[PDB]
Amino acid sequence: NRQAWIGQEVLRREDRRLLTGTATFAGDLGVPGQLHMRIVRSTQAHARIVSIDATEAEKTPGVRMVITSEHTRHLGSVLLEELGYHEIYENIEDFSHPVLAVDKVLYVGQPVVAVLAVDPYLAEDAAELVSIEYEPLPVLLDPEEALTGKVELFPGRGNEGARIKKAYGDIDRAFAEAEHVIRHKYVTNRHSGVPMEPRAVVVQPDPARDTLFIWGTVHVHDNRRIIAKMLNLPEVNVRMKHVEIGGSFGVKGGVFPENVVAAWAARTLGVPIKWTEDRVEHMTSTSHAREMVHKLELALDAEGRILGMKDEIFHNHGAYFRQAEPLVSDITAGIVFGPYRVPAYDATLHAVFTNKTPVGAYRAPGRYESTFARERIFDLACAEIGLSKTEFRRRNLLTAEDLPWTPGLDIVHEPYHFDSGDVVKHFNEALEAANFSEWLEESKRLRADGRKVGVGLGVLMDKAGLGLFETGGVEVSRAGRVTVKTGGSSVGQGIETVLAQIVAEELQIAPENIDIVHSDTELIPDGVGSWSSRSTVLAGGAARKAALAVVEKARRLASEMLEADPDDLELTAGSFKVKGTDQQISLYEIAAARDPFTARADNDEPGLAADAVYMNNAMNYPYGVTLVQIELDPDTGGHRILRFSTSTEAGRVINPLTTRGQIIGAAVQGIGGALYEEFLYEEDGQPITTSFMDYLLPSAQEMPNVDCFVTEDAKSPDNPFGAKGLGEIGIIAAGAAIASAIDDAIADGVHTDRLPVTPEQIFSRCQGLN
Amino acid sequence: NRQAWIGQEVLRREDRRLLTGTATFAGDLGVPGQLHMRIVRSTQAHARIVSIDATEAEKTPGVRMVITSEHTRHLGSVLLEELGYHEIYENIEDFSHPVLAVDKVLYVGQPVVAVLAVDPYLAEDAAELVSIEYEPLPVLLDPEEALTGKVELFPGRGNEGARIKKAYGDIDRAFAEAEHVIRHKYVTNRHSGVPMEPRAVVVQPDPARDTLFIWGDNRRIIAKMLNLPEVNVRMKHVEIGGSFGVKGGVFPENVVAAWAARTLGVPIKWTEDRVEHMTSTSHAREMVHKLELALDAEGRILGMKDEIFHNHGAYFRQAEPLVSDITAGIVFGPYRVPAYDATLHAVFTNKTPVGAYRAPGRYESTFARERIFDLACAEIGLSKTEFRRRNLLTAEDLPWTPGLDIVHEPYHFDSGDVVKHFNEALEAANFSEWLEESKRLRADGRKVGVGLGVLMDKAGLGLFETGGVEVSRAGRVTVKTGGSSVGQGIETVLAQIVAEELQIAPENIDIVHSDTELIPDGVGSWSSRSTVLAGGAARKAALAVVEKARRLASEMLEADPDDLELTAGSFKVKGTDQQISLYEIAAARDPFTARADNDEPGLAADAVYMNNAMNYPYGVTLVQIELDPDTGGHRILRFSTSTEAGRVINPLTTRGQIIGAAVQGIGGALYEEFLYEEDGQPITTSFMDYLLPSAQEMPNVDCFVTEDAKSPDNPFGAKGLGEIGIIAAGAAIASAIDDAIADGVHTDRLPVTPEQIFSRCQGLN
Amino acid sequence: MNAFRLTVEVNGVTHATDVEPRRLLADFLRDDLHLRGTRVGCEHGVCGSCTVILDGQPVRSCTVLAVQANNSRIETVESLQKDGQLHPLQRSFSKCHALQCGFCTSGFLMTLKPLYDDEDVTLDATSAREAISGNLCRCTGYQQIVEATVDAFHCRDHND
Amino acid sequence: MNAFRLTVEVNGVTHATDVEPRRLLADFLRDDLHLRGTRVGCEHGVCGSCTVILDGQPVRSCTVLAVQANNSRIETVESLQKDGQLHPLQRSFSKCHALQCGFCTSGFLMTLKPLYDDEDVTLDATSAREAISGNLCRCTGYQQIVEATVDAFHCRDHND
Ligand SMILES: Nc1ccn([C@@H]2O[C@H](COP(=O)(O)OP(=O)(O)OC[C@H]3Oc4nc5nc(N)nc(O)c5nc4C(S)=C3S)[C@@H](O)[C@H]2O)c(=O)n1
Ligand SMILES: Nc1ccn([C@@H]2O[C@H](COP(=O)(O)OP(=O)(O)OC[C@H]3Oc4nc5nc(N)nc(O)c5nc4C(S)=C3S)[C@@H](O)[C@H]2O)c(=O)n1
Ligand code: FES
Ligand code: FES
Ligand code: FES
Ligand code: FES
Ligand SMILES: [Mo]
Ligand SMILES: [Mo]
Incomplete structure (x- = not known):
């Protein structure tokens, strides 16, 4: 019996939690002595302020405190984003507000002042009574007139954004020697993920000061790393707890101003703090995306084959970087060519700023906007050349032949190099x-x-390794069940099911008996996360060599348990049949036997120095x-x-x-x-x-x-x-x-x-x- | 240079938590949707039963449920003792409740029925309204009367304990070859710790296909009885206000809470009544000692001898009978004792089950001896003081691997006085x-x-005790230990040990323990153990991080070298021209291909372990x-x-x-x-x-x-x-x-x- | 200044409690009747998750002040499961992968419940779509839900 | 069964709440007032930990129904530390290692507080022992506590 599980249609493991409603979400959490944060947000798109009147907000009963900017520019760094940096140059800023600065406002919906009250009803009751007088400044909206830059957002200025450039060989001759040269600009709409669960955070401090518990949903729940550094209390002691998430689409991916304000306020009061977002707020505060301007150009011959392709792109980042670093903009500029024969290229991406909600990464970020314009210039080209879109794409797709086709475009850093390792x-x-x-x-x-x-x-x-690693762990038990720790995160796409199959396949144990634990940084001190269609080969690749570490730890350990050497029957139940067909030792009894006998019955081999799992250069x-x-x-x-x-x-x-x-x-x-x-x-x-x-x-x-x-x-x-x-x-x-x-x-x-x-x-x- | 931390009077770390009121105790914990558990306890010392089903309890609005033996007996089974020696006779017999009896009752205080209400007031309110039918039975109280029929507690064949003997040398020819022979029967108290914090347990379930959170490392038993592992723990850290070995390990209350929390998905909280404590928790000290002593005309010991009857109360908690095995081992203390017979009875009576109160079996034995001694110093008239001066140790004859069946304390192997x-x-x-x-x-x-x-002390314990050391970013070090803070300032002792080996002020070390998610394995803190054990872990880990630094901080700069001046908190290189700090190393090495610390105790071949430590x-x-x-x-x-x-x-x-x-x-x-x-x-x-x-x-x-x-x-x-x-x-x-x-x-x-x-x-x- | 005493039946269990009038039914059904099963996404009768059975009729727990529900039967997603066995609607939803995140699951399930329990009608793909349409999901989109509901109604009626 | 409206000033902070009369002050202070600093060991005015300042006089928070504290000032061990600094008593309690578990710390400290704040008397080892005697401890043997209190009173008065 060599029962296979990978590739099989198995009903999800997450299903029952969500169906019955036993699963807890961030908003579902309650802690005695809770304070409820409501945020006073901006009502101007661009304005500097004099804000000093929370007097009647402070004086309404039930309100314990109103947090102004002066509290939080303290320590109270400003929202760092991490590696992927070079850096070039530089960073600050954005980051967002990043936390309520007592000077200027750069978009409607920006946090300015946070209140803290007993119930969320009284919380925003006091939020109204806060008054901030504004000096309206001129307002920037069009990405193109951002960089033709009067009306500058940052007084340091602080050139709007980062200019990414990539370009192969000889496109000057590829264009100059072309019969049909096609120029057109495209504009994509500004839209985002807008998931059903709005953002929500709960922080409970252990006023013994030792630690801090965050049932917040910070989307790499292993990016306590930011909050830690920011608050200067690192790195355990910021212990993150697992919660279910109601969809994200990368829109929730990372650290927000709300996350740190809560965490700070929790720490310095020894009082649990709860936060739950308005939908309205979500629409003006949660990361945006999708807004670009795509000037494009094509070089074509009487055959219709591609020779040259590209010009400048204007990514509207909103007002701020929000762990929304050039990352996506850097990706976009890398793949506006898709899977085509493209001899040469000239990306000049201008990641720019406007008075809009800071742009994050929506599902397939930068690739919805690029594969649009690319396929909207190809279709247009067929109009002049004269013949079918079907038979144009058909014979200048991606010669292979060619494969491995190291491109074809840049100067290939998507997001680093070198690629495209199109060995597939x-x-x-x-x-x-x-x-x-x-x-x-x-x-x-x-x-x-x-x-x-x-x-x-x-x-x-779509496997942004990340590079090198991803952690995983499998554990067998005295009770029949199996446990899998992983650096993955169930946004609700079936990780906990996929991994269970992967482990099931290798361990010969039904995926029912396997449970999966994630995003609980006490069990899992290190993990990468879940973004850019990755978690299977990475975290599933972790699960494999974990489950493959036990089989040796077990099969080796089983040969010592009975006296037969490591050859037998073929060995799965999951248990151990030597011979054909006397006796047997189950996989769980092996584990139950490794008790306090000088040892331990488990595996967690990913990874060390010179990492594990190993996924490196090419995705x-x-x-x-x-x-x-x-x-x-x-x-x-x-x-x-x-x-x-x-x-x-x-x-x-x-x-x-x-x-x-x-x-x-x-x-x-x-x-x-x-x-x-x-x-x-x-x-x-x-x-x-x-x-x-x-x-x-x-x-x-x-x-x-x-x-x-x-x-x-x-x-x-x-x-x-x-x-x-x-x-x-x-x-x-x-x-x-x-x-x-x-x-x-x-x-x-x-x-x-x-x-x-x-x-x-x-x-x-x-x-x-x- | 540099200075020393170990052996120095350092103001302990636990202080500030407790002084200010930041410190959390199990009773201080509150969880939304909580059910408050009140336990209906026995009022008969010995009886069979015909219980009601209230009804009039469950009827009272605000009462969610009432747990009888019907629920808990299927299952888990009877409480489960510990490792792993002593399985030489076969109990149950005991353990304790277990978990709730609807057959016989064996002491006033025994849990019979648990109620669950919205507040703790309505709990005790409705618990009263429960009525239990009793048939009284002959009541045992005297340890001697226990073993000689006629009344029995475990009406099968059982029936009244374990017999532990130890002997070697020729006891009798020593008794024959002596002038003065001394006899007397000593009887000892029944105390316990009676700490200032009564027992308390809070359990929070993750009702979604998951776990249990518990506040109050013997997860191991509850996990097993509930068949809930792989743990799936999840024991959470709370400061404790006095164990003295009384709060021990697993109680009936401990497992009822977990069961009920699991099968309901509702937070469950339990805090003990003082009256409950005095009748429910680890008793101890109750022993009878028959003692024979043989002497030559000089007055040196030629051998000890006789029976000891330990009144274990009604059941076998922890100790199991670890205490009873230990006692029979060291009634002789620090002496020339050529040979002796030591025979011990672990017996039961209708009293609160016995645990391991501070130095269990040592207060008891030490009485009987230094009192059979003063009596020889009366009957021979020789000075009470110089008897002991004439007759303690063998200054030169060390190592002194003892006579009788020894060491066997509790077991394997040796032993002797090398201290x-x-x-x-x-x-x-x-x-x-x-x-x-x-x-x-x-x-x-x-x-x-x-x-x-x-x-x-030592009781390895044993064989090991886990530890770990983390240095990172912000100028602090975090030390994880298997031990437990009970009030002895363990979090400080380690803070010194680490600080000394790490060249950094102890005001910078924070200590984490008893968070089982973080600390997957460990022993607790028993019979004066952890400083050698759990400290030897902290050393082993802190000795590993220094080699992680002083060899991979060698590469961060030039050169090997490898060098003079090992540490002043950092490493000034090849002279006093400047250096890398120790936190800066740690700050560097996190997303870059590896992680910046150590939990060296231990591996498949163990660590740290100080092995049968005498x-x-x-x-x-x-x-x-x-x-x-x-x-x-x-x-x-x-x-x-x-x-x-x-x-x-x-x-x-x-x-x-x-x-x-x-x-x-x-x-x-x-x-x-x-x-x-x-x-x-x-x-x-x-x-x-x-x-x-x-x-x-x-x-x-x-x-x-x-x-x-x-x-x-x-x-x-x-x-x-x-x-x-x-x-x-x-x-x-x-x-x-x-x-x-x-x-x-x-x-x-x-x-x-x-x-x-x-x-x-x-x-x- | 003004407290109001609720006498409401929720999933069978009757409750008596004093609440301030302005608290919405959704917030009441999650605190302190800790039935987190009901979920809140939009804030103005759109998202769907919000949805609960009120007196047999599916209404939004979010456009109803908790106080308006006095002396009435209320049922949430917690009330489907009857002794371990998931209500068939829940089964077919997992059998057809009709849910990925979880949010749009109370909403749809409770919308479909009285429709299920009453003997009519069949639900074919076209009439199935119209039924759930009062609830939004950002993950499926609906194809499998529509497939899920239909399956539930076949094992219901014609059923071998 | 009819709740009583209580008004009490705790640590300077005023409070207004309905409580049922039978609730003990100790349990009121711990819940929902969420000052776990006050600890409960015995149940009949013996253990000591129980002890709190009521209207300037140290009394047991455990032989007093909460309702009995209406319109009165109450202070707990929480009120000692002001602006990060530990009040002299706490500071010297650490200097002499006058605590081990934590329980018998609210009790002793609050018993000693008004005695400290009033200009008399000295506290010598003999008169020190009699002062704390109203509180029990199972860890220190009082020896260090007695030593701790004395130290606190020397930096107080004869200060250098
Ligand atoms: N049952 C599955 C699930 C996933 N995969 C693939 O294997 C990997 C495991 O998923 P993961 O690594 O989490 O992919 P991402 O980290 O990119 O997140 C999943 C993807 O698709 C999603 N699906 C979602 N579904 C729900 N219900 N809710 C969300 O928030 C979701 N968010 C996302 C987001 S964001 C993205 S980009 C992915 O490459 C995926 O393409 C698979 O083969 N089979
Ligand atoms: N500051 C210290 C503390 C302890 N030690 C020694 O080093 C070892 C570390 O302590 P631990 O391993 O916890 O020893 P035990 O497990 O035996 O517990 C300590 C001992 O002494 C105690 N002291 C206590 N003090 C307080 N305040 N509260 C308790 O519950 C206590 N419980 C106990 C109990 S139980 C016992 S038996 C112990 O052997 C001890 O003798 C030391 O040298 N220096
Ligand atoms: S939030 Fe109430 S109906 Fe969508
Ligand atoms: S709403 Fe996110 S999965 Fe249906
Ligand atoms: S416990 Fe209430 S006075 Fe000691
Ligand atoms: S330390 Fe336990 S009471 Fe003083
Ligand atoms: Mo994503
Ligand atoms: Mo102990």
Whole structure:
């Protein structure tokens, strides 16, 4: 019996917690003697202040204290972000406010003053009574007029952002010797993750001062490292506790001003502090994303093959870096080329500042915005060259042949180098088999008195190792069960299930008996976290050589327990059959026997100096094509997405049932970005989309009756097991394909630039009939 | 250079927590949604039952549930003792409740039924309304009557304990080959610790497919009984206010809480009533000693002998019968003892189950000996003092691997007295003695007495004790230990040990313990153990970090070198031109490919472990009482206990332990006894009946008298000290009293009541 | 100045407690009736999680002051499970991976509950979508939920 | 069964709360006032830890119903330290190692407090013992406590 578990559809381990409601979330936590923090936020977009009136706030009963800026610029550093630095140069700042500075305000929703009261009702009751008089300054909003820079945000100025540049060989000759040279600029919409759980933090101090407990949800819960350094009380003593999270999409990823204010205030009062975000707040305070300006250029010959490709990008970072370091901007500038033959290139990314909510990293950050413009310049190019988008992408995709194809673009640091180590294979048979699966041609064939069709491709910077390591640990027990410690984090995508399978496979124990513990920094003093579709080959790779450390620790230890040497039958139950077929020793009894007999019955080998797990220089790049067909009502602005199918090649799907969730779910978040979601600021500076009535989240009825999934496990990469990151591959080309279809269905020019596609824009067909 | 921390009077670290009110105790803990547990305890010393199901308890609004034996008996099974020797007979029998009885009841105080309410007031409110039907049964109380039929506690075959014997040499031919042979039967008290904090437990479940959080390393049992591991612990740190070995390990209350917290997903809190404590928790001290002693015309020992009956109370908690095994081993103390027969009975009666009170079995045995000695010094007339001077140790004949079945304490293997010379202690520890003698100047002052104490401190313990050292960023070091802070200033002793080896002020060391998530494995703090053990861990770890630094901080700069000047907190290189700090090394090496510290004790082949550590401390106690012949009150005019012990890590806190321990013993000598009426009902249940010593009665005087002689063979050669203060406080007082009448050393039954000091005019007649 | 005494039935257990009028039902059902099962995402009758059974009708625990619920039956997600066995709706939701994060699970489940318990109707993919539409999710999106609900209604009725 | 409205000034801070009459002051001070500094050992005015300053006079917080403290000033061991500094008594208690567990520390310290603050008397070893005698300890043997109190009174008066 060699029961296999990886690749199998097994129902999630997380399911029952969430279904019954036994699972606790950050907002669910209660601690006796709690104080409830409410935050007085900005009402100006750009303003310096004189704030001294919390008098009637301080004097309403039930309120224990009101925290001003002067409390917190103290010690009271300003929000550091970490490695990925060089640095070039420099950093400060942003970081955010970073904590309430008693001088200037750089966006509506910025923390200025925190109150502390007994119940959250009384907390904001006192928050109203706080008065701050403002000097309104001029307001910056357009990324392009940020750097043509009058109206400077920082008085030190403090050039807006960081300028990233990457460019191969001889693009001067690649362009100069081209027949069709194509220039167009694209604009992406400002939108984010907007998960269902708003941000929430609970801090309990151990006033014995020794320590501090944080049931806050800080999204690398092993980034106590920041709070520690900031508060100067490091590094244990800041012991983080595990909580379930209601979705993040990287939008919650990192340290916020709220996190430190609470932690500081908790420490210096010896009193537990609780914080729970407004949705409204979330819309003006939680990290933004997606807003770019994509000037692009192409070099093409009479064949239609690529020769040269690129110009400048303007990433609008909002007002501040927020562990939203060039990281994403650096990634974006690395992969606006995707999985194509691109002889040369010229990135000049301008990460810039405006009076908006500080930009973090939304699901597939910088790659939704880039694979849009890239596929919106390719579609446009087919208009002049004259012939099909299908057979353009078809023969200048990614020659292989070529593979390994060390590019092709830069000067390749994505995010460091060198890459693209595209050792993973056949670029094309995906697109080929993806349309041989099976329609596309079948309703390009349309009697089409309705409307039309679209395409788009997405490669992914999706195992950001991180580099070198990731920790893991497996433990067998006296009670039948198995325990797995990991540096992973259940944002709700099924890590605790995937790892259980990985361990199940290697240990020959049902994934039911295995439990997984994460984000509890007392058990797990070191872990990396969960971002950039990574946690399987990294943390699952940790789980493997952990479970593989026990099998030796056990099988070796079992040969000593009976007297048979390490050869037997073949050895799994999980237990130990020597011979064929006398006797046996179970895997748990082995562990139960290693008690206080001079020892210990467990493993945790990742890692040491010269790390473990080892994933270094080159990450895997998964690639995928999205296929869409839309109908449109022209007398109004309506549309009904008739068909949808994202198909992505990624070696070794670990859990097919759950990966389907990660593909479909993401794809919808893409349609949300493509046709519904935009943060609208009024020309003076105030946010307009603050409620849910304004910001449009896709609902059940409007979505495609099915997103089809075409994944194949050809060409496993060489990081055993040969698997890929898949938690982002849904949204990548969701924007471009929708756009192409809309332009194909009208039909004028293939000339759409700005997302989203509002119903007002989409009667420019009233023009067509006129 | 640099300065020294070890052996220096350093103000302890625990102080500030306790002084200010930041310090958390299990009872101080509150958790939202809490259920307050009140336990309905036994009111019969011995009976079978026909319980109600209230109903009238469960009916009272605010009552969520009532736990009977129905729930807890399936399961977990009976409480589970400990390692792992002693499994040579087969109990249960006992353990304790276990966990709730619906068959027989075996002592007033035994948990029968637990209620669960919203506040603790409604708990006791409804617990009253529970009615239990009883059928009384013949009540056992006397240890001797216990073993000779006719009444039984475990009505099967059991039936009344364990028999522990130890012998070698020829006892009888030594008894035949002797002029003077001495016999007497001594009877000892029933005390316990009775600390100022009563027992308290809080349990928080993570009801989502997970764990339990517990506040109050023997997780191991609860985990097993609930079949909840792999732990899944999760024992959390709380400061404790006095164990004295009374709070021991696992109680019935401990496991009921966990069960109920688990099967409900509701926070459960329990805090003990004082009346409960005096009837529920570890009793001790109750022993009978038959003693035979053989002597030549010179008066040296040729052999000891006879029976001991330990009244274990109703069940086997911890000790198990570790205490009863130990006692039968060291009734001979520090002496030339050629051979003896030592036979011990661990017996049961309808009383609160026995645990390991400070120096368990040592107060008891040390009485019987230094009283069978004063009696030989009466019957041969030879001087009480120089008897011991003639007849303690073998100055030259060391190592002294003892005669009889020894060491076997508790087991494997050896042993013997290699700790320093005995007498020049007794000799040198007589500052003030012989002029304390000059009495009466015919008066009413009367008393002078002596007592002697070996201690199986050490009790390896053992084999190991985990430790760990972390240096990082902000100028502080964090030390994790398997030990427990109970009040002895363990967090300080380690702070010194580490500070010395690390070249950094102890004001910068913080100590973490008893957080089982952080500390996956460890032993506790028992029989005067941890300073050698858990300190030897802290050394081993702090000795590892220095090699991590002074060899991989060699590469951070140039060169190997490798160098002069090892540390002043940092490392000035090859001369006094500048250096890398020790925190700066740690600050550098965290995301860069590795982590910047050490938890070297230990690996698959163990560490730190000081292995069966012998390490026997020793000393004298010197007592001068005044008596008031009618009233029979007394004023201890002078008191001085003596101790030779290894290195003595901290003189200030060691003084506290010694002085503190004595007062507990003096309390046992003249104040404390658990009293019972004929029907088995406990009498001394409040504080007015059980008399703890107070400020006025105790000697303004206690002379610290410690000597650093030959260190043992366990690094920086140290000894266990937290139990030697008490040892002889029994024997010395009694001999002092009998010298104080006089009519000669004929007192047995402790304590010494003033009614007993009504030999007043039975001295005149 | 003004306290109000609630007499409410929640998941069977009746409660009597004094609450200030302005506390919303959602906050009341989480404190101190520690039934964290009900979850709060939006703040104005949109997110869905909010949703609870009030007197048989699904309403938002978030647009109702706790005080308005006096003398009424209330049921939350905690009330589905009956002795270990997950209510079939919960089973098919796991059988079809109808949930990844957890938030949009009280909301949908409680919306679907009275619809389930009443003998009609069938729920086909089209009519299934319309049913759940009152609840938002940012993870699935719905495809599997729609697939999950349907499955639940087949083992319900035609059922071998 | 009808709660009483209590008004008490604790450590300068005023409070207004309904309590049921039967609640002991000790339990009131610990809950919900969340000053765990006051500790409870015996249950009948013996242990000492119990002890608190009531209206300037040290009394047992455990032989007094909370309701009996209405419109009165109460001080606990929490009120000693002012602005990071430990009050002289606490400082000397550490200087002489006058504590080991922690329990018999609120009790003694609060008993000694008004005695300290008032200009008389000296406290010599004999008169020192009689002062603390109202409090029990099972760890120190009082010897060091008696030594600790004396030290506190020398830096107090004859100060250099
Ligand atoms: N059942 C699964 C789950 C994940 N994977 C893949 O294996 C890795 C393990 O996941 P992880 O490393 O956590 O991926 P990320 O750290 O990038 O996070 C998951 C991904 O997809 C997500 N899915 C989410 N789903 C829910 N319900 N809620 C969120 O907040 C989520 N947030 C995210 C975010 S953020 C991203 S970017 C990922 O590469 C993923 O593509 C898989 O093969 N099978
Ligand atoms: N400042 C100190 C403290 C202890 N030691 C010695 O070094 C060892 C470290 O202490 P530990 O290992 O805890 O010794 P025990 O486990 O035997 O506990 C200490 C001892 O003495 C005690 N002292 C106590 N003091 C207080 N205030 N409260 C308790 O509950 C105490 N409980 C005990 C108990 S139990 C005993 S038996 C002990 O052998 C002790 O003798 C030392 O040299 N210097
Ligand atoms: S928050 Fe109340 S309904 Fe969405
Ligand atoms: S809401 Fe995040 S998983 Fe459905
Ligand atoms: S316990 Fe209340 S007075 Fe001692
Ligand atoms: S240390 Fe336990 S009472 Fe003083
Ligand atoms: Mo992400
Ligand atoms: Mo002890």
